[PDB]
């Protein structure tokens, strides 16, 4: 099985999700 492919996909998806949530939080609070 291609362990590295799931590796990279899961890791980058989590990173992007975290970045999007951080941006949402900043817009909700920091931007005001």
């Amino acid at each position: 099985r291609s362990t590295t492919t799931i590796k990279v996909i899961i890791v980058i998806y989590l990173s992007v999700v975290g970045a999007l949530l951080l941006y949402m939080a900043f817009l909700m609070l920091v931007d005001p």
């Binding site: 099985r1 291609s2 362990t3 492919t5 799931i6 590796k7 996909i9 899961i10 890791v11 980058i12 998806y13 992007v16 999700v17 999007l20 949530l21 941006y23 949402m24 817009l27 909700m28």
Partner: protein, 704 residues
Amino acid sequence: PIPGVGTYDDFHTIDWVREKCKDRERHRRINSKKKESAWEMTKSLYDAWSGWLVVTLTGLASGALAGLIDIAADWMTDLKEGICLSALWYNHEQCCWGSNETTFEERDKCPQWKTWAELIIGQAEGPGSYIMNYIMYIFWALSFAFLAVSLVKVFAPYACGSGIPEIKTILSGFIIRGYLGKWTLMIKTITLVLAVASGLSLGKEGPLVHVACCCGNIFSYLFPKYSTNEAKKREVLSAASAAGVSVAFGAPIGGVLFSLEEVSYYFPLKTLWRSFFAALVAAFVLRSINPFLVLFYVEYHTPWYLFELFPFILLGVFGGLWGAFFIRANIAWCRRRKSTKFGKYPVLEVIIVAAITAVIAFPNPYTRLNTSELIKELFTDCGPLESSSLCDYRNDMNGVYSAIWQLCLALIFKIIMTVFTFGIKVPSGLFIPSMAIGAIAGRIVGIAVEQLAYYHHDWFIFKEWCEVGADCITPGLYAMVGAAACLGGVTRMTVSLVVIVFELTGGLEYIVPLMAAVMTSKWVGDAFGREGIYEAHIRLNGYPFLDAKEEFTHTTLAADVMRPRRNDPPLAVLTQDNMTVDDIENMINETSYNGFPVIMSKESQRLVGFALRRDLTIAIESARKKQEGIVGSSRVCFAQHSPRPLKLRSILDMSPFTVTDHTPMEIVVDIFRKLGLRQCLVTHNGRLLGIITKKDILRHMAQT
């Protein structure tokens, strides 16, 4: 010309004729400049390869995004059941992939994977463990749904929904700026993964088409030819939709057939090969990434028999029925969301639906399992190696009633949930829910037919077709046929659907049963209504979409739909000469007309051309900036070459389409559909009399 001329405002249709003329003018310019210098030749070569390069980029991006979304969705969905402590980055199957504790009874039973009860309760089995698993599953579903809806609302409102209806409108000339932007693409991918993880009655396969379309638009921005011209960009979007379907179901040919049949309003012949090539590229990338060549491969040893066609036809009917019901239910519910106050709280609606879905899904195995996984399990043929509960009865005698009851409960739950889950403000796809419903129904029918064959082999049909004591019946085939029938009934897709199913299951021998079931389901759906789910959603949203089915009343004539009519004042006209810039600007401000006719004289009413309001204002402002002294007093001369009058003949349409008043309106709708015209100027005795617009035709059709 003036910068910005020929551009289109948001939520405004394009005129395919002007876009085609602009494309040909640009082609002539590039070809003429080729000989000027070698660098011009390289630019022209790049322009020639622009279509191939853009479709290649779209296919690559679609494949990569589809693989990423599929793997992330699988891992997140497995997150609800538990976590793999040894590997916080594997799903349930991957965590137990290398486990040596796996048993025949439980293939995914490994110590490395730990259910939330094990993490917290500490006992794998017991009432407390079951309760904690239940509550954690509900909590994870709610968290995923809430995060998906919050991301949709905060960043990309367009990310919500499958997007196929909006892509239909876009490919018909409509413009929705921001739908295919970077924000929409990113938010749609993330929220698709989150929603699929939440366990809601939705699928990522349909929305993958919109993801591909967004990628195609972004890549079209790279190549000047496709960025400048809207029709060229829409051809790229058709190729993108084909690639999206390909990645969604691993069905390149089915993807091209879907693009031609459903989303592409105009499908040039070259776009056929471009779409197929893009689909193959995207499928290749997905095969290189997602696997770790048929997603729903099936192995039916016994070939389908002629008598089995009758149950398949029955499935067809059922599909149709459900289809109609959904198109009558979901739309209504969606309409309620637009009319009542529960649409003001999309996040609350999403959270409540997720809570209900998880609560009713956990008790039953099929509903708890992922919809795609359930479809795959249903498609598999029963065998001695298989330990599926569905086939347990077959292992017993050869509890059927218990398995059928569980399947019926899953069917009812899915049917009810899909009505309230389609249209909510998160990415949702109808393909997977419809396929699951049809597959459950077909599995039930196939189990019933197998029981009939085994119990009653004395019947001449059963004895002739099937040897006594032989499992000729194949429940997986019946489930496949039922899924195809349900999808065809709900979507009213006939050939693209059949080819998509064939490529998704890799079974050519079962083409005929699928064709029969799809035809039957489509015919019953038509009996209940000629409009599919996507057309119904387009009509509900109010988008300006015109279809070949729509036609006008036969007493209608061009004069009836003419804008001026009787109550309305005479439609605004611009004098060719002796007319001021200030007056033209005042006319632009006064009326919201897409464009005004330009006549040589007010008394004669002889049409000279058609000058777009956007083009007119852009040209006036640009000339004011360019040339001093244009304070609005200077006159404007639309005729061919101290006052320094502004020249707006360049932005004027020299040869606008004209139709006689006596012409029936139905001829006009045929003309508009074929040439995709925004407006046609009805003239009587060679003088302008009125204007018909695509919006006028759409409004009058809606009224009828």
